[PDB]
Amino acid sequence: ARVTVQDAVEKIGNRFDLVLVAARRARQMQVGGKDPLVPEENDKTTVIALREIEEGLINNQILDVRERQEQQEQEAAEL
Amino acid sequence: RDVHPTHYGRVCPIETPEGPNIGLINSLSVYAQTNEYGFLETPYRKVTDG
Amino acid sequence: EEFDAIKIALASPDMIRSWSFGEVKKPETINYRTFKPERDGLFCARIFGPVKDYECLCGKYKRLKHRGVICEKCGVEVTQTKVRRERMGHIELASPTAHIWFLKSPSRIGLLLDMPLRDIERVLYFESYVVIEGGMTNLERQQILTEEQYLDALEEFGDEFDAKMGAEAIQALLKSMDLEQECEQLREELNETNSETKRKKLTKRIKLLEAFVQSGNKPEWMILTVLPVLPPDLRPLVPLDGGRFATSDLNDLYRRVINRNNRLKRLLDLAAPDIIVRNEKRMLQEAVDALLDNGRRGRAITGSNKRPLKSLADMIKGKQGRFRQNLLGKRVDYSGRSVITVGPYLRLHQCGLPKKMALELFKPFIYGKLELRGLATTIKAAKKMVEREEAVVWDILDEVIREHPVLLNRAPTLHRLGIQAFEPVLIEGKAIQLHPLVCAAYNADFDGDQMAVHVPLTLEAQLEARALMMSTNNILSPANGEPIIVPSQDVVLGLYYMTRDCVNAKGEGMVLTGPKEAERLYRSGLASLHARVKVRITEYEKDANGELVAKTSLKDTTVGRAILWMIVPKGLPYSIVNQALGKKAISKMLNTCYRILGLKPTVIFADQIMYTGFAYAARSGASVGIDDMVIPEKKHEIISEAEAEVAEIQEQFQSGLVTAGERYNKVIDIWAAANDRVSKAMMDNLQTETVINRDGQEEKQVSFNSIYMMADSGARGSAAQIRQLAGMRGLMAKPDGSIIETPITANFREGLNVLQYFISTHGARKGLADTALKTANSGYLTRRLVDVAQDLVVTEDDCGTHEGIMMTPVIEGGDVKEPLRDRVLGRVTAEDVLKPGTADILVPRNTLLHEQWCDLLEENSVDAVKVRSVVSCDTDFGVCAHCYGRDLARGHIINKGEAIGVIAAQSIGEPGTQLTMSSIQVKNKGSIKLSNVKSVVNSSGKLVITSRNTELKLIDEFGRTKESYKVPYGAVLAKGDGEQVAGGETVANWDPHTMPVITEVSGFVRFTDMIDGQTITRQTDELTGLSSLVVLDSAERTAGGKDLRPALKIVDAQGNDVLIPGTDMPAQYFLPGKAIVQLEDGVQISSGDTLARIPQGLPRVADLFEARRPKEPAILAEISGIVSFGKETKGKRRLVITPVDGSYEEMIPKWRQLNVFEGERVERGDVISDGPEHDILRLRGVHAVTRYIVNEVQDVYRLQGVKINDKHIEVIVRQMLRKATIVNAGSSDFLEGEQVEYSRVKIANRELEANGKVGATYSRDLLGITKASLATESFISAASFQETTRVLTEAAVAGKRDELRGLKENVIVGRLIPAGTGYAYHQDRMRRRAAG
């Protein structure tokens, strides 16, 4: 959280992907403004994204499975 | 930039700057004046026969 | 927008007109009153652009009445402005003139023609003519003709020869010539006579000729005919605020072309006489080069400043230009400076900040939040609501601030940890607050050293300031395995007072129940910080698997030692806090804390070691004065007892006995021999002089001095710094630096003399004039160390290739020096390695070597193991994590994506600033090893050797060596190798002056091959009588026997030569000078007795990396075999070697002493001269090349107290070896050296099964590392920093291109760096090339 993002690296496996997979996560909530999964606890968007990470909730695949159902469910709406 | 035994009496060993001009600037000690030529003199007392 | 690569070539004069917009024909810039751009001028609107919005000059086409219409009266359009930077102008010359990058420097144009620059300089200066083309074959091309011999070439023939004297005369020589006739005729005779110094010009031109062929460059463009003019936002003409103007320099320089070109085309119209038109075209190239290189060709050119001008290239040359100062480093918004100050209440991830600084800095972030609040309505409204002091201004400020971390910076940056990223806390001040514990990370203290501040505005870098650079992510420095939160001054002192073992405190002996209740007793005045009290505790261990197992025990401990147990998170023994807790124990007590419990407890822990360290100092109080420093009474007599002796050898010096050196070396000793004992004067008088009485008579314990508790703490110094206070302060010296005869008898407690203060400046002003230029020499050395490492980023997990270097200790010289396990620690094993009970292989060809697997190797007595280095890794364009082991900074398995080199280039160049300031005896008992030995049993019984490679090494019985020392060729011993040697027994002995020529064979002597007057003298011993034929030195004797090698033949009674045991080689000593053979004729000498005796830094680091050979290289043995000697001193001695089956004779400076004799056998890997020792790369392997260098410069740091992991230097040795000279051909060129990786490419496509053998074999090469950055495939990586004129000539003659692959390339162009967070990007860019 405020002090530590080490447990956030024993989840993914990479210090640099954490800079990417949280930024891809928080950009759906910075200006995309979606619902967060953890409660807020009066924190900015970068802190709820890392608190999301520790319980195994936002991965590289979970950032893409969440969109790929959402892509075709949007692409079953245009026609 | 460094001292030498003729410095004593004429030029102080403690009022220099520190950085890239440490050995270029000096300051003359309180008792000295100069010559008609411009070489520094510095007083002493003589001892005639003890 | 986006572009893949770039390209550079010579620009044609057709390309220039297609680049441009209009021909600048008049020097007028602005009129004298109407400040206006000028028609057909330099700032012209008809060429370069518009200025005001949709507004022409005279007022015909305005206000979008006529969209695409030029005001044809004045020549000016209406269109969109700000093209005054993009839109270049041009100019067409009348006489063509020459580029100065392509002429002055090889010349690269006269180098093309093999024509001298002095042959050019009669032509392009208008001194004498030259031929263009002899029509008749009587003359030949490239022939300078003087103007008087030109008329003879006129009046002979007239029409059958063509010759000018002009720049056109060189221009005609480029249009005329062909290359396919030349470059296949240079092909024709490269095979005729390939002698090198003629063939190296056949190497360079078949480059240079065929450079132009396949690329598309032409050398016609190499002499200018058209010029491009800089768009006037690069050459402005600006006013000041006071109506005064100030221009760029190039408006002046461009002016000198357009006038002097004008008074040629007008002077052509009037047909000036043929003397003057020459000087007309002289001045153009005088003033064209004034643009390119002001002070290059002749005398410098200055103006009204009376100082030289900044040229066109001087905007790219040096650090005054744009590569070194305005592209890599920059200016920056969103930043500021202030002064530092401490905080004893910030936690580690926090830091202070002013309000007035942040509210002024975070002004773009407030104006977004106020509209989301709506108290401010618009933007200009919200700016108004800053000055009006709203409570919501400081309720949005903190709400902007919270979880937005912030960089801080300090100069000089010396390594990675100079920049960090804390979290803000506000305070009501105007000075940047800072944690105290980060002062080890900066080598800084609080004397007003300012610090920068920076904000990561984007989302992504804000995460980098939290995931990468947040100050609790990185505690462990990349130099070693000890952290950088070694507690600095008072936290190491507040402990050392508190943990102590005296008997003074009341309450000692009764038992307590828990470390809570000591609060109830010590504060009440029934307890003392140090009182030795039995206490029952409850510690915790992890003897299960990650699970706490309880135990509870009692400890006869002290009270202050017990209160530390209130914090420590139940994993450490009570024995770890059972000491005095100096700086030695505390830093390991963090190291052992995260050795066991992981990282995150040791960031909470160091927080609560700082809060106590001031708090029990605030109980204690540390006070100093004059009374604390005590002089013992043994000061009067100890100097007086030598003061009677300083007149003693002076009185010898009045008797005329002692020389200068023997008296100077004795007056320096006895004046300082007692100074050695003034440490013994203050030890027993000031360590246990205390007398506190406690249930006995007295007590001998620790001191109550409050000084020796400060140095065993670790705050400032140790027991050598008190010697300048309590005793006398050593000796003194001159800034020349010779050691003084009379040292000091006074100090800082009694009072020095007016002369003792005079000469004290000498050691101090020099001592600051030394280091004030020793910070320059490291900011040099760092800057090129980061340039060889600018390509190094990991690629793959494994190469899986052959094994590499071998891990052994460095224990030579004295005792243990480096533990093998620590050099083992952090790595991956290379070879399948076992335990000393056979075949217990602990690796599956690779194991990560952390500290518990290091404990296994310390357990077994085995001490040799192989570990992959960067040399045995062979992934292209990177290294592998299976050959790096542990990233020392993060402290676990190195991932994929990280940098390698620049962390080591920050590691190695950091403590360069902190750096610059007989008989061999056995030590203990054990085993004996001395191998690679051929020796003899002497006339005394013991091992006497007659070989070079032998030396003594002392081992224990287990196998792990204690000592080793060099023994000379021919050393007399007292025990045998492979025996038992007791401790303290004299093994070896030899005279230092002589190197023995001791007889290994045993035969009679005979005075052969020397007759007195030819190669020798007769020097009989007038005292003894015993003297043989006395050989003389190299210059005194007669030349009539100087071609005859003088040999005392070993003969027997029949007349033979007594052979060596084993060989049929004759045994006679070809004895060189000064070697007086003792015994006369007919005497049998033994085996093993002398026939003749032969009696007699940081720029040091800048040899070891800058790839320099010494001035006195010690030659090795080229090829082995039975060697003879050679020629007699035609400059130097030659060496006739004849191998056992193989195939050289070369110079020898014979005025030094040789090693191997005229007929002795030598093996490769042996010096043939004496001295210090590229050759070891030429004839030996690869690993031993890296061995001597790593074991020399890491050795330097141990001498002056630094520790650096040897991998960092090994990282450079891989970047020190990139190239490979080639022997054969068939696929490519023949002998030019090339990239070793690419030399491993063409074996894998052509020497592999496409063809049986068509390739070319190759060794390893070695550049200087200051030019290995200049000798590169990328060129802007080489043009950014050094010699920018040269590297942009040769890049353009060949038609190079770049791939933007180095990380200095992606940073200048605004791209993302190919490392770290951006490496996971750049491979998608890399995979999109191969797929589309």
Ligand SMILES: [Mg+2]
């Ligand atoms: Mg300071």
Ligand SMILES: [Zn+2]
């Ligand atoms: Zn107009």
Ligand SMILES: [Zn+2]
């Ligand atoms: Zn490898």
